[PDB]
Scaffold this motif. Structure first.
Motif, PDB file in Angstrom:
ATOM      1  N   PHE D 137       0.840  -1.188   0.000  1.00 42.41           N
ATOM      2  CA  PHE D 137       0.000   0.000   0.000  1.00 42.41           C
ATOM      3  C   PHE D 137       0.882   1.248   0.000  1.00 42.41           C
ATOM      4  O   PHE D 137       1.887   1.286   0.717  1.00 42.41           O
ATOM      5  CB  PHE D 137      -0.911  -0.016   1.232  1.00 42.41           C
ATOM      6  CG  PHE D 137      -1.737   1.226   1.410  1.00 42.41           C
ATOM      7  CD1 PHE D 137      -2.981   1.335   0.817  1.00 42.41           C
ATOM      8  CD2 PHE D 137      -1.285   2.273   2.197  1.00 42.41           C
ATOM      9  CE1 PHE D 137      -3.742   2.471   0.982  1.00 42.41           C
ATOM     10  CE2 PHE D 137      -2.043   3.408   2.362  1.00 42.41           C
ATOM     11  CZ  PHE D 137      -3.274   3.505   1.757  1.00 42.41           C
ATOM     12  N   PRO D 138       0.542   2.298  -0.782  1.00 43.06           N
ATOM     13  CA  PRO D 138      -0.603   2.524  -1.674  1.00 43.06           C
ATOM     14  C   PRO D 138      -0.365   2.127  -3.134  1.00 43.06           C
ATOM     15  O   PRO D 138      -1.098   2.583  -4.010  1.00 43.06           O
ATOM     16  CB  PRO D 138      -0.829   4.035  -1.555  1.00 43.06           C
ATOM     17  CG  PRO D 138       0.491   4.608  -1.121  1.00 43.06           C
ATOM     18  CD  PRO D 138       1.416   3.483  -0.760  1.00 43.06           C
ATOM     19  N   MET D 139       0.633   1.285  -3.390  1.00 44.30           N
ATOM     20  CA  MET D 139       0.960   0.811  -4.731  1.00 44.30           C
ATOM     21  C   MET D 139       0.612  -0.667  -4.882  1.00 44.30           C
ATOM     22  O   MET D 139       1.354  -1.445  -5.484  1.00 44.30           O
ATOM     23  CB  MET D 139       2.431   1.071  -5.041  1.00 44.30           C
ATOM     24  CG  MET D 139       2.734   2.541  -5.274  1.00 44.30           C
ATOM     25  SD  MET D 139       4.439   2.995  -4.931  1.00 44.30           S
ATOM     26  CE  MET D 139       4.369   3.263  -3.165  1.00 44.30           C
ATOM     27  N   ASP D 140      -0.536  -1.060  -4.338  1.00 42.35           N
ATOM     28  CA  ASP D 140      -0.976  -2.445  -4.280  1.00 42.35           C
ATOM     29  C   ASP D 140      -2.083  -2.702  -5.295  1.00 42.35           C
ATOM     30  O   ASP D 140      -2.758  -1.783  -5.763  1.00 42.35           O
ATOM     31  CB  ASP D 140      -1.467  -2.805  -2.873  1.00 42.35           C
ATOM     32  CG  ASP D 140      -2.531  -1.856  -2.361  1.00 42.35           C
ATOM     33  OD1 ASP D 140      -2.592  -0.712  -2.853  1.00 42.35           O
ATOM     34  OD2 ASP D 140      -3.304  -2.249  -1.465  1.00 42.35           O
ATOM     35  N   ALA D 141      -2.254  -3.981  -5.631  1.00 41.25           N
ATOM     36  CA  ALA D 141      -3.285  -4.441  -6.548  1.00 41.25           C
ATOM     37  C   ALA D 141      -3.995  -5.639  -5.936  1.00 41.25           C
ATOM     38  O   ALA D 141      -3.405  -6.395  -5.160  1.00 41.25           O
ATOM     39  CB  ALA D 141      -2.700  -4.823  -7.912  1.00 41.25           C
ATOM     40  N   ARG D 265      -2.308   6.597   8.765  1.00 37.95           N
ATOM     41  CA  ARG D 265      -3.008   5.323   8.848  1.00 37.95           C
ATOM     42  C   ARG D 265      -4.502   5.489   9.154  1.00 37.95           C
ATOM     43  O   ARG D 265      -5.190   4.495   9.407  1.00 37.95           O
ATOM     44  CB  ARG D 265      -2.320   4.441   9.900  1.00 37.95           C
ATOM     45  CG  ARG D 265      -2.727   2.967   9.925  1.00 37.95           C
ATOM     46  CD  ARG D 265      -1.900   2.175  10.918  1.00 37.95           C
ATOM     47  NE  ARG D 265      -0.544   1.906  10.452  1.00 37.95           N
ATOM     48  CZ  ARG D 265      -0.193   0.878   9.687  1.00 37.95           C
ATOM     49  NH1 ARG D 265      -1.084   0.015   9.222  1.00 37.95           N
ATOM     50  NH2 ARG D 265       1.088   0.709   9.381  1.00 37.95           N
ATOM     51  N   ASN D 266      -5.025   6.717   9.101  1.00 38.56           N
ATOM     52  CA  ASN D 266      -6.412   6.954   9.495  1.00 38.56           C
ATOM     53  C   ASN D 266      -7.394   6.209   8.598  1.00 38.56           C
ATOM     54  O   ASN D 266      -8.404   5.685   9.080  1.00 38.56           O
ATOM     55  CB  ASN D 266      -6.714   8.453   9.473  1.00 38.56           C
ATOM     56  CG  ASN D 266      -6.247   9.168  10.730  1.00 38.56           C
ATOM     57  OD1 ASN D 266      -5.729   8.552  11.661  1.00 38.56           O
ATOM     58  ND2 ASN D 266      -6.435  10.483  10.760  1.00 38.56           N
ATOM     59  N   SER D 267      -7.113   6.145   7.298  1.00 42.42           N
ATOM     60  CA  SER D 267      -8.029   5.582   6.307  1.00 42.42           C
ATOM     61  C   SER D 267      -7.621   4.178   5.881  1.00 42.42           C
ATOM     62  O   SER D 267      -7.744   3.820   4.706  1.00 42.42           O
ATOM     63  CB  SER D 267      -8.110   6.503   5.096  1.00 42.42           C
ATOM     64  OG  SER D 267      -6.834   6.663   4.499  1.00 42.42           O
ATOM     65  N   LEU D 268      -7.131   3.371   6.818  1.00 39.71           N
ATOM     66  CA  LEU D 268      -6.645   2.025   6.557  1.00 39.71           C
ATOM     67  C   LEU D 268      -7.121   1.112   7.679  1.00 39.71           C
ATOM     68  O   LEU D 268      -7.312   1.580   8.808  1.00 39.71           O
ATOM     69  CB  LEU D 268      -5.109   2.013   6.484  1.00 39.71           C
ATOM     70  CG  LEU D 268      -4.397   0.811   5.864  1.00 39.71           C
ATOM     71  CD1 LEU D 268      -4.568   0.816   4.353  1.00 39.71           C
ATOM     72  CD2 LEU D 268      -2.924   0.820   6.232  1.00 39.71           C
ATOM     73  N   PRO D 269      -7.330  -0.179   7.414  1.00 36.02           N
ATOM     74  CA  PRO D 269      -7.608  -1.103   8.519  1.00 36.02           C
ATOM     75  C   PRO D 269      -6.386  -1.298   9.406  1.00 36.02           C
ATOM     76  O   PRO D 269      -5.244  -1.065   9.006  1.00 36.02           O
ATOM     77  CB  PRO D 269      -8.001  -2.407   7.817  1.00 36.02           C
ATOM     78  CG  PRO D 269      -7.468  -2.288   6.450  1.00 36.02           C
ATOM     79  CD  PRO D 269      -7.550  -0.841   6.114  1.00 36.02           C
ATOM     80  N   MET D 277       4.129   2.826   2.694  1.00 28.61           N
ATOM     81  CA  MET D 277       4.114   4.208   3.159  1.00 28.61           C
ATOM     82  C   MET D 277       4.778   4.344   4.523  1.00 28.61           C
ATOM     83  O   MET D 277       5.408   5.371   4.810  1.00 28.61           O
ATOM     84  CB  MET D 277       2.676   4.720   3.216  1.00 28.61           C
ATOM     85  CG  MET D 277       2.555   6.217   3.425  1.00 28.61           C
ATOM     86  SD  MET D 277       1.198   6.933   2.483  1.00 28.61           S
ATOM     87  CE  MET D 277      -0.196   6.463   3.501  1.00 28.61           C
ATOM     88  N   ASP D 278       4.652   3.319   5.368  1.00 31.85           N
ATOM     89  CA  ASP D 278       5.262   3.363   6.691  1.00 31.85           C
ATOM     90  C   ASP D 278       6.777   3.461   6.598  1.00 31.85           C
ATOM     91  O   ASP D 278       7.402   4.196   7.367  1.00 31.85           O
ATOM     92  CB  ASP D 278       4.860   2.127   7.490  1.00 31.85           C
ATOM     93  CG  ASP D 278       3.382   2.096   7.809  1.00 31.85           C
ATOM     94  OD1 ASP D 278       2.756   3.174   7.864  1.00 31.85           O
ATOM     95  OD2 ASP D 278       2.843   0.988   8.004  1.00 31.85           O
ATOM     96  N   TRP D 279       7.385   2.723   5.669  1.00 31.70           N
ATOM     97  CA  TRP D 279       8.835   2.786   5.515  1.00 31.70           C
ATOM     98  C   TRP D 279       9.284   4.171   5.070  1.00 31.70           C
ATOM     99  O   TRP D 279      10.288   4.697   5.565  1.00 31.70           O
ATOM    100  CB  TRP D 279       9.298   1.722   4.520  1.00 31.70           C
ATOM    101  CG  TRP D 279       9.123   0.324   5.023  1.00 31.70           C
ATOM    102  CD1 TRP D 279       8.317  -0.642   4.496  1.00 31.70           C
ATOM    103  CD2 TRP D 279       9.765  -0.267   6.158  1.00 31.70           C
ATOM    104  NE1 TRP D 279       8.419  -1.797   5.230  1.00 31.70           N
ATOM    105  CE2 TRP D 279       9.302  -1.592   6.256  1.00 31.70           C
ATOM    106  CE3 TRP D 279      10.687   0.196   7.100  1.00 31.70           C
ATOM    107  CZ2 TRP D 279       9.729  -2.459   7.258  1.00 31.70           C
ATOM    108  CZ3 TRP D 279      11.110  -0.665   8.093  1.00 31.70           C
ATOM    109  CH2 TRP D 279      10.632  -1.978   8.164  1.00 31.70           C
ATOM    110  N   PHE D 280       8.550   4.781   4.137  1.00 36.51           N
ATOM    111  CA  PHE D 280       8.878   6.132   3.690  1.00 36.51           C
ATOM    112  C   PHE D 280       8.787   7.124   4.841  1.00 36.51           C
ATOM    113  O   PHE D 280       9.685   7.958   5.038  1.00 36.51           O
ATOM    114  CB  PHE D 280       7.936   6.536   2.557  1.00 36.51           C
ATOM    115  CG  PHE D 280       8.368   7.761   1.811  1.00 36.51           C
ATOM    116  CD1 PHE D 280       9.192   7.659   0.707  1.00 36.51           C
ATOM    117  CD2 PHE D 280       7.943   9.015   2.208  1.00 36.51           C
ATOM    118  CE1 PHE D 280       9.587   8.784   0.017  1.00 36.51           C
ATOM    119  CE2 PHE D 280       8.336  10.141   1.522  1.00 36.51           C
ATOM    120  CZ  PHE D 280       9.158  10.025   0.426  1.00 36.51           C
TER     121      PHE D 280
END
Ligand SMILES: *[C@@H]1O[C@H](CO)[C@@H](O[C@@H]2O[C@H](CO)[C@@H](O[C@@H]3O[C@H](CO[C@H]4O[C@H](CO[C@H]5O[C@H](CO)[C@@H](O)[C@H](O)[C@@H]5O[C@H]5O[C@H](CO)[C@@H](O)[C@H](O)[C@@H]5O)[C@@H](O)[C@H](O[C@H]5O[C@H](CO)[C@@H](O)[C@H](O)[C@@H]5O)[C@@H]4O)[C@@H](O)[C@H](O[C@H]4O[C@H](CO)[C@@H](O)[C@H](O)[C@@H]4O[C@H]4O[C@H](CO)[C@@H](O)[C@H](O)[C@@H]4O[C@H]4O[C@H](CO)[C@@H](O)[C@H](O)[C@@H]4O)[C@@H]3O)[C@H](O)[C@H]2NC(C)=O)[C@H](O)[C@H]1NC(C)=O
Ligand code: PGW
Ligand code: PIO
Ligand code: PIO
Ligand code: PX2
Ligand code: R16
Ligand code: HEX
Ligand code: CL
Ligand code: CL
Ligand code: CL
Lengths: 353, 332, 344, 352, 345
Positions: D137-141, D265-269, D277-280
């Protein structure tokens, strides 16, 4: 086949039965005995002033038309037959769209004794009004009511009574508590009569006494406010020449108190009066603002823009230096003592009542 | 039984598809309303909730009977068997009847053919609110009803003199509003299907400003008073007065942002917006005063006495603005 | 007389076949329609739909229901509609809809002597409306309601607007806090599916968003913060704490405003018009902070070198500050003029 | 009369018909040919891990009990008569809460051919479970499934088939797209058998392939983080004697990074693993503390508490502090490392 | 296996059938064997104190009235025949809201067997209450149960049992919850005594263990990093009052904001959770860090002039106090972390 006799008895039960008429019509008053088993006292919503309660509601009456004789003493009736028999039209006066459970089948039961005694039980989830007065919030207590009675039949036609004495006719399960911030102290049970444009109706009332738990709010609001007030006073111990630092202390504490006040009211409904928490927040804001005003007064009388060098010697009233402010020295003792006295008075006043 | 044979005889040959007096005269309905409670007023959705006992009375010659019994009192069992008016609420967004434990309806039939029919209802009704004077605004929310299919030539509704009545208003779920009074009206409304008798009950509500005084007015005034403390700090303490100015400006911006959360997204200026904007102007001017004082004192080189002038000017101007604002919005 | 009316109504419903349309082997039934809009509730950008309450009336002739001797329009109880054929009308883009049912089902059935039938319903329906938010909040939307027959084709049923352009009424009485209805349109056509042609009616509305709310909510705070950023240009160059505090505070406030504005609305991937303005304001305040960073670097990193050796000039902090004072307001005004002329 | 043979045929169609028994019970297997027309692919809810879909669901089968002879070649059945015959008990295996539209009338259609072929079409809205793995995420399929079959009849009783080739039996409308942050790349159609405690059942499956759009998150999270990192480096260009200003830089950038990390992370489970995104965000967070620690180290080696006055002269090696060589190296090293990290990150994640 | 013969058999079975009487009305209790296939567990909510669960729920019981011969295969009938047959009055005691799925038709199964066995299946999604003890949150373990009971029949009329024993419930191992992991599940069968008569009861319990990975990123690491940020104050000179005060004030206010913001997404429980203990410890650490500089500044600027006129670390030397803080604050924070994580983990 030994089951033909039971089918014969069930078939002939409703011969000539008119379910549009209450039992004993034109001869006496229908007597309904009621009892309640609260399986769980649901959560209480302060925003809606509503509470939920899941109950087994049992009613009992007599219908001479449905008498029978045979080897059996009690007959169980299915839902199709129960809909063809008169039942009381009980409803909750302060109801808010209760629900009758229907999984896997309609959770209700009807039993008939040979002498014509009908017992009728159902499982319900009742949402009911609990109007509240939040003046003493978060140290307030409430008496949430539950009132029920007949909708269409006046006291001259249908009357309600408690099966046992009123105290023991409403039974709350020991483990059935779903309250988070309330304690169910007890209940009171009563009956009465209500007037209306259609006539006089019997009403059965049960009050549940609730007391709010203060533990959440102590952590959420009171302790941050106390720490902010204590933090504002730490500025008294810094040298008067550190003008930006003490200004930062004052403005940050004032902003923190404003944020805490804004966040505190989000829990309650938007009532138009001050609660006990509001007075505490107001007094804490007064203390913080007074600390900032004290710093401003100290800065007004500061003469030199430079602090003590470190090596020079200060004689008793070459280069000279500012003296330690007398306002600071008195404030260091005055502010904590007054705040402690205010806390004593506040907590003694509100917890005792 | 005497009652059984009477009920059976009444339903013989009855056709509930037809009105009483289908082709003779209009059917006259007498309406009555008991208000259990007026629920919360949702300003965002422009609606309010209400709980009522709604009663209708009319005459049906087909239901006349001669007997020693003068009135039959019946539950909801017979409601679907006889003709009932198709009354509906015109301004209702969502309405529902009550069905626990049984349907909350009552029927009563007199020997002369008079029928009384009552039921319990919970209605969400739209109420368009003008919020120009918010939070000092007053509204007149309506509740309208009429027959859906029968025009004025076929059904006419009427009030029972002291028709609308209320119980204990202290137990109601109104928090931001206080119930002032009510009134009733009747009129004729023209549609493509014909002319219909529409009857309305207006409830007058006046907002209670206590919540907003705590939430918006007092914090903004306190921040404005905080901005004046800069006038007493030494002008040489450049970072201190700058910090005061920026803190007051940001706090005012945040307060302005959160003041509009309760309201809907109207496109006009309310009374609260004017107060917040004036407080913003005052704190911004307080910062600009020190900016020009510092520039004229040091960066560039009566002007030196600007703090002394401001100490008098700013509180006096704030008091004058508050006097004018409150006098204009409360009394006039 | 009720007895004659009862006899006539009993005669009409006896032998009636609900499974056959009015002219089963004949030409298609012409069903006229009209709508009266009672209200338009919230138009949701998050859900991309709008809710509509209306009185929906259908008109059609049925020879089997003709009666004589009663010069009256028989308005019958709504329960008899279950005993009569009615069109199988439905809405393509509807997501959730219902008929109001208090005190009874809000349904009308009225017969006329010549067999004409008027059938009315009170319907609240949520309908999908995909919105292009590239010009938000200076955008216009076109939201439609499509009406079609589920089963029948043009050889069996035909739709038309009853009253032409006057078929839909009550639109001018609608008011929304956030939108203004500028136009509404009626269209009737025949969609040619693979299995024949199907009648179609379409009701379109054009909504224009009101800018007044956003002016108070976003634009004025951004302009005020940007103007606040310029106050640093009048502060002395050596007061590093004050100017740095101004710049950092303004930059972080702009970021916070942009984030909190973008918290709402759906997670669209493209840039809105409001995003362009917020990004421009961010660039302006960031350049304001970088101006003082450059001034401080120039002074405390070139003064020692210039003294030892011995658009505005790059060796005079006062000149740089004066140039910034002149240029930042002018450039911001030009940016505002270009922005507001482009989107209006 | 012209319109009497139809009534006679409709009346005589159901004589002796038992709708409790499927066609060919105890003689053969009931074959159902199915197809789907997706009128709109509804929104996808990441938080609930589900998606909505609006479909026209068509089923066709054979019932020899309902064959007839007459002038007409095909008959239409109303809702009542449609309820009087046998129909398949099809259901969606991963459906959460589906709806059958019935405004104004029930959106159903039943047609009977003279040979006894039944065609049954419905309009449905289905909410279906789409479990997601959000490591990229956010580059997931994702490949969201839609599975359906009979609830009661095993493979020995009822079998499902596609009306045409499986790829061509699910048709998505060109205008039917209600996706905001996803692109529908395509779909793949298949069928199979599933075991369960009651027996073996035929299942018909359609996987819809979705790719997330990165545009929203680039504006929402990535650009603020990059601007914060760039902002933290600006302090390297200020003189070392401005102790409060550089401390303000450090603390404010740290607070901004913390707030961005909390709000990302507000709009994620509430998944238990770290996304891309966490690593960035973590790397940017480390860069900001690297800048602040650099300032602390520079301040540790500052001797004099006063900056260089504009008039004096600094002799070559009243005295003045020299420009820190840590600052001079940090002016290039931090931007260079941040650029290299961005190159590596966007190279290794945009073509995964 | 002609359809006409099956039609005759089915008509014969339902002719004279009395839905109002249980299969063995005069005889011993009818034994009902239940089993469940769990499709998913959706929303374990601490705010509402409940969980949602979708399942295929099957009940088996023998009815001699429905026995048939000749046909050698099991008859799967149309689901509408369930209304024409007796079925158990099963219900869920701790249910708050539930329904049977109804698309395309009612998801219901009736299957008869030659010996009279009836299989009755339903696809049910249920919200069930689960009161959670959040004292050790987010390092907590929860026990959530589903109770199955008969509304009106006692043990003299109906008996419950899990058919297949421990294998009655299926599909638990294939569930993937994002926040929890299913550690164990248990089946229990017993008889409750609510009155003068025993009632059958079945219970399906699950034990859920919360995943710590989300909270490590959300709460613990930001608080640790803010606590580490405060120690930078100890490396700055005492006379830089603006910088050190700004650092300390920022750290304490950020800790307060984090603590206030975290607790709003949970029920208003009155007791202290494990996360609250950690946040309070971090707050105390940053507060003491700020009070350290307050003490140093007071010592210097309020006892230097007096000591000069008159003429653990050394209280007279400001630098000694700073160095002592540098050594001691990280050590004490590490010790606190060790004691905290050893106690809860
Ligand atoms: C689109 O599709 C939709 C889905 O298919 C469809 O929905 C439905 O429409 C139908 C018809 O319009 C509705 O049916 C009406 O519902 C009334 C009750 O409404 C409320 O309750 C239901 C749930 O209902 C059951 O539950 C209630 C209690 O709530 C019981 O009272 C009922 O008996 C029934 O019983 C079971 O379930 C209980 C648990 O729930 C058990 O405890 C119980 O034991 C039973 O097992 C809710 O769903 C409703 O909510 C919705 O609707 C309202 C209004 O529309 C909305 O505002 C709301 O938001 C919801 O959407 C609502 O809360 C029934 O009373 C009614 O039945 C009466 O009339 C018909 C004739 O019209 C009779 O045949 C019938 O027997 C009923 O009454 C008789 O009884 C009345 C009342 O006593 C008498 O006055 C009358 O004279 C008559 O008496 C005679 O006959 C009797 C026969 O036995 C005899 O006993 C008497 O003695 C007497 O002789 C009718 O069923 C249905 O509710 C809608 N909703 C759903 C979910 O199905 C929709 O229409 C479609 N739309 C279009 C455009 O196509
Ligand atoms: C982010 C900030 C972090 C700061 C943290 C700093 C670390 C140090 C603090 C630790 C807090 C301790 C938390 C205590 C637990 C939370 C409070 C609590 O639940 O205790 C109850 C007593 O409350 C009560 O008497 C209510 C009154 C308690 C008020 C305590 C505040 C003392 C203020 C004195 C003024 C000093 C001013 C300074 C002057 C020098 C027990 O009742 P009981 O079981 O019967 O349940 C009945 C029903 O009321 C629910 O409890
Ligand atoms: C809201 C308005 C409030 C108005 C409050 C008005 C308060 C008010 O009247 O201030 C005067 C004085 C200021 O005392 P403070 O110690 O701050 O200031 C010293 C004082 O001004 C001496 O007079 C100066 O010496 P001198 O004369 O030049 O030789 C000395 O100069 P230097 O040696 O440094 O060069 C100054 O530092 O305060 C009190 O003593 C009251 C203590 C208790 C006050 C109450 C505390 C709770
Ligand atoms: C990317 C990092 C680049 C670092 C590369 C490292 C670059 C490097 O070698 O710098 C040495 C540095 C201090 O150097 P810096 O320029 O800050 O300080 C000068 C240095 O102390 C001279 O020795 C002093 O002259 P003198 O002879 O006494 O008169 C001079 O005093 P003055 O002229 O003012 O009178 C000081 O200004 O000491 C370390 O431990 C750095 C740890 C680095 C840790 C890095 C932390 C992140
Ligand atoms: C993707 C990787 C990109 C890396 C590119 C790095 C290029 C810039 C690095 C600095 C190089 C440099 O020192 O020359 C800039 C000149 C002269 O500097 P000096 O060495 O003579 O002191 O001095 C100047 O004129 C520079 C202007 C400084 C203005 C101060 C604000 C700088 C903003 C920093 C943004 C991170
Ligand atoms: C119903 C009249 C209410 C009048 C206002 C009462 C104010 C009581 C003090 C509460 C002040 C709010 C807390 C301080 C906000 C910074
Ligand atoms: C009201 C605050 C007074 C501070 C000491 C003069
Ligand atoms: Cl609670
Ligand atoms: Cl209100
Ligand atoms: Cl989407």
């Amino acid at each position: 086949d030994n089951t033909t006799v039971f089918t014969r008895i069930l078939d002939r039960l409703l011969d000539g039965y008119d379910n549009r008429l209450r039992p004993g019509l034109g001869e006496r008053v229908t007597e309904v005995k009621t009892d309640i088993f609260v399986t769980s006292f649901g959560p209480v919503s302060d925003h809606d002033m509503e509470y939920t309660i899941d109950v087994f509601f049992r009613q009992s009456w007599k219908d001479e038309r449905l008498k029978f004789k045979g080897p059996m003493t009690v007959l169980r009736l299915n839902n199709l037959m129960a809909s063809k028999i008169w039942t009381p039209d009980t409803f909750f006066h302060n109801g808010k769209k209760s629900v009758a459970h229907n999984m896997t089948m309609p959770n209700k039961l009807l039993r008939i004794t040979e002498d014509g005694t009908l017992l009728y039980t159902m499982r319900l989830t009742v949402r009911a009004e609990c109007p509240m007065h939040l003046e003493d919030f978060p140290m307030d207590a409430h008496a949430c009511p539950l009132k029920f009675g007949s909708y269409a039949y006046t006291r001259a036609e249908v009357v309600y009574e408690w099966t046992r004495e009123p105290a023991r006719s409403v039974v709350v399960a020991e483990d059935g508590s779903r309250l988070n911030q309330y304690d169910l102290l007890g209940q009171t049970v009563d009956s009465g009569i209500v007037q209306s444009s259609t006539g006089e109706y019997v009403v059965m009332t049960t009050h549940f006494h609730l007391k709010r738990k203060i533990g959440y709010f102590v952590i959420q609001t009171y302790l941050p406010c106390i720490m902010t007030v204590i933090l504002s006073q730490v500025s008294f111990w810094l040298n008067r020449e550190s003008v930006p630092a003490r200004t930062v202390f004052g403005v940050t504490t004032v902003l923190t108190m404003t944020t805490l006040s804004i966040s505190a009211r989000n829990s309650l409904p938007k009532v138009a009066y001050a609660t006990a928490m509001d007075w505490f927040i107001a007094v804490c804001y007064a203390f913080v603002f007074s600390a900032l005003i004290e710093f401003a007064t100290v800065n007004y009388f500061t003469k030199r823009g430079y602090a003590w060098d470190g090596k020079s010697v200060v004689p008793e009233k070459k280069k000279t230096f500012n003296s330690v402010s007398k306002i600071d020295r008195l404030s260091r003792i005055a502010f904590p003592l007054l705040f402690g006295i205010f806390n004593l008075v506040y907590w003694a006043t509100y917890l005792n009542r | 039984g005497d009652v059984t044979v009477i009920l059976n005889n009444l339903l013989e040959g009855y056709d509930n598809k037809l009105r009483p007096d289908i082709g003779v005269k209009p059917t006259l309905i007498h309406t009555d309303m008991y208000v259990n409670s007026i629920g919360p007023v949702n300003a965002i959705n422009m609606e309010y909730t209400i709980d009522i006992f709604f009663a209708q009375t009319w005459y049906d010659r087909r239901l006349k009977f001669n007997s020693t019994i003068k009135v039959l009192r019946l539950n909801s069992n017979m409601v679907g068997k006889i003709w009932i008016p198709d009354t509906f609420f015109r301004n209702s967004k969502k309405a529902d009847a009550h069905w626990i434990t049984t349907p909350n309806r009552m029927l009563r039939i007199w020997n002369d053919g008079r029928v009384l029919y009552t039921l319990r209802l919970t209605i969400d009704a739209e109420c368009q609110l003008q919020l120009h004077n918010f939070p000092m605004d007053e509204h007149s929310c309506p509740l309208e009803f009429s027959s859906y299919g029968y025009p004025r030539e076929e059904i006419v509704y009427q009030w029972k003199r002291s028709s609308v009545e209320v119980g204990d208003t202290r137990s109601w779920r109104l928090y931001q509003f206080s119930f002032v009074g009510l009134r009733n009206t009747t009129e004729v409304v023209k549609t493509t299907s014909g002319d219909y008798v529409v009857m309305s009950v207006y409830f007058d509500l006046s907002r209670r400003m206590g919540y907003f005084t705590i939430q918006t007015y007092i914090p903004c005034t306190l921040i404005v008073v905080l901005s004046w403390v800069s006038f007493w700090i030494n002008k040489d303490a450049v970072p201190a007065r700058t910090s005061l100015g920026i803190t007051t400006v940001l706090t005012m911006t945040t307060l302005s942002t959160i003041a509009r959360k309760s309201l809907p997204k109207v496109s006009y200026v309310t009374a609260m917006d004017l107060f917040v904007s004036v407080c913003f102007i005052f704190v911004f001017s307080a910062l600009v005063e020190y900016g020009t004082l510092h520039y004229f004192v040091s960066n560039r080189k009566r002007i030196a006495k600007m703090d002394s002038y401001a100490r008098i000017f700013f509180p006096t101007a704030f008091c004058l603005f508050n006097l004018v604002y409150w006098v204009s919005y409360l009394y006039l | 007389n009720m007895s004659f009316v009862k006899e006539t109504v009993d005669k009409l419903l006896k032998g009636y076949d609900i499974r056959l349309r009015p002219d089963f082997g004949g030409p298609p039934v012409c069903v006229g329609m009209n709508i009266d809009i009672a209200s338009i509730d919230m138009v949701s950008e998050v859900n991309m739909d709008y809710t509509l309450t209306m009185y929906f009336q259908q008109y059609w002739r049925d020879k089997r229901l003709a009666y004589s001797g009663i010069p009256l329009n028989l308005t019958l109880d709504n329960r008899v509609a279950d005993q009569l054929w009615v069109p199988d009308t439905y809405f393509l883009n509807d997501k959730k809809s219902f008929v109001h049912g208090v005190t009874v089902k809000n349904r009308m059935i009225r017969l006329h002597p010549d067999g004409t039938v008027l059938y009315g319903l009170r319907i609240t329906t949520t309908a999908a409306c995909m919105m292009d938010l590239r010009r938000y909040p200076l955008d216009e939307q076109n939201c439609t309601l499509e009406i079609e027959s589920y089963g029948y084709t043009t050889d069996d049923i035909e739709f038309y607007w009853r009253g032409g352009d006057k078929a839909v009424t009550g639109v001018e009485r609608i008011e929304l806090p956030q939108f203004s209805i500028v136009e509404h349109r009626l269209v009737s056509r025949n969609v040619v599916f693979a299995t024949g042609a199907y009648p179609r009616l379409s009701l379109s509305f054009r909504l224009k968003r009101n800018i007044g709310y956003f002016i108070l909510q976003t634009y004025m705070p951004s302009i005020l913060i940007t103007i606040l950023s310029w106050v640093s240009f009048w502060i002395n160059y050596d007061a590093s704490a004050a100017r740095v505090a101004l710049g950092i505070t303004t930059v972080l406030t702009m970021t916070t405003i942009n984030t909190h504005l973008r918290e709402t609305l759906p997670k669209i991937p493209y840039v809105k018009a409001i995003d362009m303005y917020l990004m421009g304001c961010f660039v302006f305040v960031f350049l304001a902070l970088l101006e003082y960073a450059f001034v401080n670097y120039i002074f405390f990193g070139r003064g020692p070198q210039r003294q030892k050796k011995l658009i505005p000039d790059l060796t005079d902090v006062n000149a740089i500050d004066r140039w910034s004072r002149i240029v930042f307001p002018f450039t911001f005004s030009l940016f505002n003029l270009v922005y507001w002329l482009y989107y209006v």
